Amino acid sequence: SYSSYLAKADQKRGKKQTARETKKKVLAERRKPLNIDHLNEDKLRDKAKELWDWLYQLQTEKYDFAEQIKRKKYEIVTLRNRIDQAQKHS
Amino acid sequence: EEKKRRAATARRQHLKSAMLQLAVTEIEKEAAAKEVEKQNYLAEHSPPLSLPGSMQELQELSKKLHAKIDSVDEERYDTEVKLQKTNKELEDLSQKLFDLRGKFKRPPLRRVRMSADAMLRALLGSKHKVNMDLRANLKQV
Amino acid sequence: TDQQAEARAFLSEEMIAEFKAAFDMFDADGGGDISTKELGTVMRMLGQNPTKEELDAIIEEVDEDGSGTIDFEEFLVMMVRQMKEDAKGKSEEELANCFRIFDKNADGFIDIEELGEILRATGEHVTEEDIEDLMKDSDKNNDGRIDFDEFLKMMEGVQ
Ligand SMILES: [Ca+2]
Ligand SMILES: [Ca+2]
Ligand SMILES: [Ca+2]
Ligand SMILES: [Ca+2]
Numbered sequence: 366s367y368s369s370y371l372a373k374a375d376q377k378r379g380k381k382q383t384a385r386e387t388k389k390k391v392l393a394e395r396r397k398p399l400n401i402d403h404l405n406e407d408k409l410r411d412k413a414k415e416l417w418d419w420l421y422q423l424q425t426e427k428y429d430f431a432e433q434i435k436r437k438k439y440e441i442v443t444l445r446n447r448i449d450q451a452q453k454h455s
Numbered sequence: 456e457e458k459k460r461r462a463a464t465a466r467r468q469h470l471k472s473a474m475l476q477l478a479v480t481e482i483e484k485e486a487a488a489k490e491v492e493k494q495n496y497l498a499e500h501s502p503p504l505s506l507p508g509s510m511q512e513l514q515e516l517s518k519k520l521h522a523k524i525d526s527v528d529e530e531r532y533d534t535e536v537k538l539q540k541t542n543k544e545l546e547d548l549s550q551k552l553f554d555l556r557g558k559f560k561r562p563p564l565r566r567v568r569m570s571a572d573a574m575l576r577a578l579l580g581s582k583h584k585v586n587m588d589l590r591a592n593l594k595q596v
Numbered sequence: 597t598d599q600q601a602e603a604r605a606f607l608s609e610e611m612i613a614e615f616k617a618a619f620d621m622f623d624a625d626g627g628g629d630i631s632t633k634e635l636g637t638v639m640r641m642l643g644q645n646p647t648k649e650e651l652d653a654i655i656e657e658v659d660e661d662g663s664g665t666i667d668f669e670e671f672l673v674m675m676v677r678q679m680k681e682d683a684k685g686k687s688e689e690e691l692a693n694c695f696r697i698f699d700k701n702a703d704g705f706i707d708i709e710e711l712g713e714i715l716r717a718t719g720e721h722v723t724e725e726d727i728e729d730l731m732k733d734s735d736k737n738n739d740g741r742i743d744f745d746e747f748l749k750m751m752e753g754v755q
Contacts, residue, residue: 392525392532399521402514409513410506416520417504420527424501427531428493430538437541439696439704440563443744444548446704450743451556467730471754473718478694485697560748561688569642570682571675577642578618585610589683592608 705741
């Protein structure tokens with residue numbers, strides 16, 4: 366089975382490269398430059414925190430997405446045991 | 456002819472309920488404690504901000520944050536994707552079980568609409584007094 | 597109509613009483629049945645945005661007289677099915693959670709050891725015999741542990 370080796374390259378490289386740009390497209394949208402540079406002095410104040418909240422915003426979400434996979438990862442472990450337990454090739 | 460056997464079963468029940476009852480009270484403990492960890496994690500990774508002087512600092516800091524944003528955001532993204540991957544993995548497993556048993560309890564994805572209790576509250580607001588669950592009602596004396 | 601039977605048999609006057617008040621609000625004109633449009637309005641009030649297809653499907657789910665509308669009877673049926681599903685989900689969720697708490701271990705099971713702990717963890721008084729007894733009664737596939745399926749079964753009935 367070595368004629369399938371060319372399938373690995375094509376496939377993997379393919380999907381992986383597809384995923385990349387998507388991530389880039391996606392992430393790019395959610396990005397508004399720091400255009401506001403030297404337009405006011407107290408502006409920075411009302412600005413800086415807004416950035417701060419956005420960060421905290423994202424941060425908090427990342428934490429949740431995180432804890433979520435963990436919980437799901439456990440859903441799996443169990444869902445796998447139910448699969449084996451429910452084998453009985455009788 | 457095992458006349459007493461009846462009491463044995465009742466025990467298991469008494470215990471089972473002693474178990475669940477234990478579960479529930481432990482369930483909310485882990486829950487809140489969990490949250491605590493969440494606010495501590497966030498406690499250091501993004502502590503109560505303190506705006507600097509002004510001139511260089513506010514600009515600097517702003518640049519600092521803004522860059523971290525693209526950073527955290529990317530991480531947030533990768534995470535979301537590993538989740539997608541995961542939810543995917545269990546959906547397939549949530550299949551390999553269906554067509555091998557059929558409709559089993561506790562599907563991982565759970566398609567749930569809003570509860571009737573929700574709809575009722577949502578529509579009548581104040582006057583919605585029925586802790587509906589299953590308890591039927593037959594005249595009391 | 598047979599469904600509208602047990603359905604109304606299931607609910608209480610209290611239930612009907614409120615489900616009516618609720619039904620009335622669904623029904624604009626006050627004719628006697630929710631239309632494919634009258635439903636749409638409420639659904640949005642409830643925070644949704646169904647499509648013509650979606651709406652009908654939701655309608656003809658309890659439309660036994662092929663009317664294309666819903667009467668306070670077909671409605672009660674609907675509320676019932678939901679009532680049911682709701683309570684089912686809440687149940688399995690709780691148990692699911694209980695299993696994770698009792699599992700403490702990760703292996704997706706519940707071995708006689710943990711069963712003991714958790715049991716002993718309750719205020720109740722128990723001797724090993726009780727623990728191993730409950731295990732033997734619960735473990736149907738006689739492999740020693742207690743899988744989620746069995747856990748659902750064993751807890752079937754308790755609160
Ligand atoms: Ca009408
Ligand atoms: Ca009708
Ligand atoms: Ca275990
Ligand atoms: Ca077992």
